[PDB]
């Protein structure tokens, strides 16, 4: 208290420091600024509309050449605090990911060094428009790009130089964060003749895939399949049950359809790859075709589907004659055709069923790569 009162009167901040004047030692280069990016949390991932809500520690550094102190300031306390108002504040701009203004990363507590350098590093709840596309769904699941920096100023006015990822990742993401490159830069453009403003470029390469869809989604696949696969088994064990063979295909039919229904529902949440979607619907087709097969091949058959003496000779005539008929039905039986039928069912459930997990594997060989 060493002239303290008095001295924070001397210096003045507001009155001796020109609030309105950026103390860049007059017209030169810049004062040299550095940004540090540390994610504190990632709360929500949207596949749909390429949008992520995440928290970042906005670690910022620049020298305040006016803030160089003396004994009853510097040395009195080599370290001291000063709020946002006594403080020129950049507007660091999430230059391609501030498709939602910055919160509670505006004008909050800063750290005042003992000979101008200043340190301001709080919390940023933000939204971003990261490069989703319908391609961020292959297993790679791409690399999310983001640039940070003091938006307005140029290379003669500002300069910003420059941490993983899983430091505080959301573990109740359905995704997985593989990596995390950080490297600054500066850049002039097409229309400008003159390089300027420098930025923090941070690529996020991730991956995601629950282990929960697998469980109720495959479950129906096999289930389903085996019904199309049984359908045809039952037409042997008894194919006369005509009506009730019928009920099964209505039944199997309707089941198949809603199930795929809640599939494009999560599918809107998130624009799905062409890779996976084809296999599912090219193949439940698989079945549909069969059920329609099941049809014609199941019901395709026309029918299968001495005077005294003179009188009982009428009946032995009636007898044989319709015996032709009666047997016209067993004709239809086609029972040495049996095992074929269901063997000719077996062959193609094997050729499809495999063709799929065969495809499953020709894509399950490269990723294990």
């Amino acid at each position: 208290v060493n002239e303290e009162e008095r001295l924070i009167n001397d210096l003045l901040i507001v009155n001796k420091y020109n609030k309105h004047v950026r103390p860049v030692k007059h017209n030169n280069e810049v004062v040299n600024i550095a940004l540090s990016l540390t994610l504190s949390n990632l709360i929500s991932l949207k596949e749909t509309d390429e949008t992520l809500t995440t928290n970042v520690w906005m670690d910022h550094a620049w020298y305040d050449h006016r803030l160089t102190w003396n004994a009853s300031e510097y040395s009195d306390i080599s370290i001291l605090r000063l709020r946002p108002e006594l403080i020129w504040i950049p507007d660091i701009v999430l230059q391609n990911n501030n498709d939602g203004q910055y919160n509670v990363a505006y004008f909050c507590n800063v750290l005042v060094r003992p000979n101008g350098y200043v340190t301001w590093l709080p919390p940023a709840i933000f939204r971003s428009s990261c490069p989703i596309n319908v391609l961020y769904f292959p297993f790679d699941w791409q690399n999310c790009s983001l640039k940070f920096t003091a938006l307005n100023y140029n290379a003669n006015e500002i300069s910003m130089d420059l941490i993983i990822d899983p430091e505080a990742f959301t573990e109740n993401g359905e995704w997985e964060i593989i990596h995390k490159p950080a490297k600054k830069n500066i850049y002039g453009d097409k229309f400008p003749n003159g390089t300027n403003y420098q930025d923090v470029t941070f690529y996020l390469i991730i991956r995601r895939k629950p282990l929960f869809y697998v469980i109720n989604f495959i479950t129906p696949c096999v289930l389903i399949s085996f019904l199309a696969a049984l359908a045809f088994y039952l037409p042997a064990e008894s194919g006369e049950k005509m009506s009730t063979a019928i009920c099964v295909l209505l039944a199997q039919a309707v089941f198949l359809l809603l199930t795929s229904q809640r599939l494009p529902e999560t599918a809107l949440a998130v624009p799905l790859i062409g890779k996976y979607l084809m296999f599912i619907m090219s193949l439940v087709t698989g079945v549909v075709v069969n059920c329609g097969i099941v049809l014609n091949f199941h019901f395709r058959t026309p029918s299968t589907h001495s005077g005294i003496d003179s009188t009982n000779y009428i009946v032995k005539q009636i007898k044989e004659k319709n015996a032709y008929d009666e047997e016209v039905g067993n004709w239809n039986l086609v029972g040495q055709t049996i095992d074929r039928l269901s063997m000719f069912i077996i062959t193609p459930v094997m050729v499809l069923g495999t063709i799929f997990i065969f495809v499953m594997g020709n894509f399950n060989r490269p990723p294990a790569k």
Partner: protein
Amino acid sequence: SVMEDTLLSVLFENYNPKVRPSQTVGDKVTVRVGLTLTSLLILNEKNEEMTTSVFLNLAWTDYRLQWDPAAYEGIKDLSIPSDDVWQPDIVLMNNNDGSFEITLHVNVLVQHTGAVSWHPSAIYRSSCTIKVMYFPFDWQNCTMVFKSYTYDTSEVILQHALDAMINQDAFTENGQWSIEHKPSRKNWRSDDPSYEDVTFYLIIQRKPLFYIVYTIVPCILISILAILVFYLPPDAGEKMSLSISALLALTVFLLLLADKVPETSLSVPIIISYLMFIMILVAFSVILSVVVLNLHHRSPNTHEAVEAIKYIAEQLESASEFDDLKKDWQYVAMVADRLFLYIFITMCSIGTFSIFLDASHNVPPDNPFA
């Protein structure tokens, strides 16, 4: 330095906060407006609301900020907050469904002989004329009108950028949709002594080909069942029961379809075009199913002393077999053949018609994008 104090102090001594960047009634100040777009994030196709993001570049000149040796000739270019002036308050005639985000009160580029550049990116809640005319393959146009909101062009004039700038300069890549172009026309509604708004056109194109595909399946598949229930009658006449099961099932199906239509129009409705006729193709496989049913219906029945007993025997069997022989006559299958070739016509024809219209809808009403 160089007369620093002096420039600095005169300037903030004669500028006025509360005032208009104009000297009395002329001319006024010709401000420049031109927004390069960032990207668009949501088209609420249902309601006709538009949330996008662009840069409001404004720029005019301030002859009250002409500098001298040290901030003119010292550093010709200096960044200075706003607050100081006349900012564009702008609302959108149709749109401006809601405030500005990152639009106003962000620093600016002040050139030495007073040129002002202000370059702010912003999100803005709009709502354009998409209408219920954003599904025909022909798609539709829209008015986007920007302009201030208590100011009557009389102390300032507004002027544009390009005209060809397009709207597919920054059309969103993520789109399952597309862009034919965005016009820009400055206008001055005489209804009003106030010179107003500017009208920006929306000749948008909406091509998301993903699920119309498997929508194709239900129309063709559903024909399957169709063909199927009309093929079953001369296939196993005893289709009797089964057949009923075909149509409980054929009906429910088309009804659940009626389940998702509403639900899909949730985000997104318009023009029953699609709908409109697949509705008619609906009613069609309605009444054909049913009359065939009728078809089926059809059948009014179907749906010495020694020798005296023998007699009695001979008569028994032959007697009722002509009665049941009757029923054979009563259900011979003349209809089956003939209407499964009515079934030929009906199906074959109504099939390749909404095929057609959809054929024609994509291909025909597309061109008139100019």
